[PDB]
Amino acid sequence: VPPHPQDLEFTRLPNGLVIASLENYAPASRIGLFIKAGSRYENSNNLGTSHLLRLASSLTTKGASSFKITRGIEAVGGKLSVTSTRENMAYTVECLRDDVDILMEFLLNVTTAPEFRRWEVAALQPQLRIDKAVALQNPQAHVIENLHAAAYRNALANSLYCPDYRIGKVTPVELHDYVQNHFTSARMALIGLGVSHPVLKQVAEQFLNIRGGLGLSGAKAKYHGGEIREQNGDSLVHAALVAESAAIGSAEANAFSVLQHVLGAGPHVKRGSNATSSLYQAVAKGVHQPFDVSAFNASYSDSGLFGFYTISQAASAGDVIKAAYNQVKTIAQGNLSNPDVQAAKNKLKAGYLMSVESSEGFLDEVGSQALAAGSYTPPSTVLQQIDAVADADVINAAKKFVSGRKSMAASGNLGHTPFIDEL
Amino acid sequence: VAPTLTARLYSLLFRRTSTFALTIVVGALFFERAFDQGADAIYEHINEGKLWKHIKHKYEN
């Protein structure tokens, strides 16, 4: 018979900073500072700076030294961690509730007091090599990196990981300048779980009144289309094929969201045939060995990519891809049942509600909601918007993929991987 | 008593390398007595009248 829940409390400061909290009466507290400072904001003279920056979150600040951050936090069983997408960095901190004071102070020192000392920074540059190395051992990491590199000319083309040529080359000035240009008020959102909105607001009005980089979530990402191919010998060919979709927020973007679930995202049932996955079922009909297909759906402030991601043996690469692509084409031609669309809706809705279940997850939603929307938008109203999707819009979503200048990335033994050109 | 005694030894005396060393040192003093006793007395018994320790009573004061 638990607490009747508190509501989220959400506040836009006139400098354009956004504060949201929830008092769940939890033994732990989570705090995120969500900045519009993701990798799309690097230019061709400073690629990688945000990745070094991602790593630099326990270097010395003005009145909290490197040693103290580590020991101070670890002393309370705290965590401090920093997560980038192509759009955002998200500096989030976690501990027991009695300890928000010590953790908040560390957090603000990192995001607003970075000293970036020559010798600390130099000591850190090998870590981009390790960090990249670890991440780039999922074939997908490369693919989705090249996929973006091929789609866009600019901005979303930039990689989440530092170019090898810049390893050892990103400077303290470049770091300093990145914070100044990007970690301002208009660009930030301070979100807190198991903290109270008065405190958050005080912290924000005291410490996060920063401004004087730039305005715009905006170079504006120029979609261009193309293909990047990488000969591996990995025996399994990974490949993703994609057209320009819809910017996150817009109604059209939910059409794609639902179309993703028609064609089919991940598995639901451990070691299942994925009876409900159209892409899986269409590819299986042709293809008699190990494969995977899933609908791919990325969505950004000012663009997005839709299509699908295949893994096949080298020789089947094309057979898989052509099977997959047809199966989309078949929805564009209008072969789509209403209970199919209904199923994908229950899949999406449940997946959403599922996604926000845990503190880590909820905080992330709210953080990004704040930066992309300038709002909070409750489940009740997200599902409403999901329900609002017409059968026709989903067809049209698929129409758009089929007819639209394409982007491809694939790596493996590419000898029987097609060429766009050839699809 | 006849099984769980190597145990009792180990807990009290052998776990700690201090009490281990203390045991060997305390144990060695008691052994040096009992050995230089016993063995000298074994060496006595195998001669019994060859040695000035037994003759002693002959030529008095």
């Binding site: 030294s65 040693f67 103290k68 020991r71 020559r118 010798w119 | -």
Partner: protein, 105 residues
């Protein structure tokens, strides 16, 4: 502001000239004993200060070998003597003393 603190200064300038590292183009911070705290602060020196430091010492050990001394012109003027290491050294000890307080609790 003061006659007397110009005198403590005159005593200091004496001892400086008297020490006579100047005489071999050295600066006070060239002469410091290398311990761990010092060693790290040399690590922390920017490229130029480091390269200048190695040259000063190289020039001096050369003179010291040949038992000579600079032209008086080329000696290091007391006023012209920059404690280029000081702030680094201080920051190092500062960081060490923190680690030392943390080790106490």
């Amino acid at each position: 502001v003061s006659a007397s603190s110009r005198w403590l200064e005159g005593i200091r300038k004496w001892y400086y000239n008297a020490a006579g590292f100047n005489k071999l183009g050295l600066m006070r911070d060239d002469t410091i004993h290398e311990n761990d705290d010092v060693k790290e602060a040399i690590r922390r020196l920017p490229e130029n200060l480091y390269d200048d430091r190695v040259f000063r010492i190289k020039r001096a050990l050369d003179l010291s070998m040949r038992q000579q001394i600079l032209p008086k012109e080329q000696w290091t003027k007391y006023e012209e003597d920059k404690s280029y290491l000081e702030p680094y050294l201080k920051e190092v000890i500062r960081e060490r003393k923190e680690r030392e307080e943390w080790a106490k609790k």
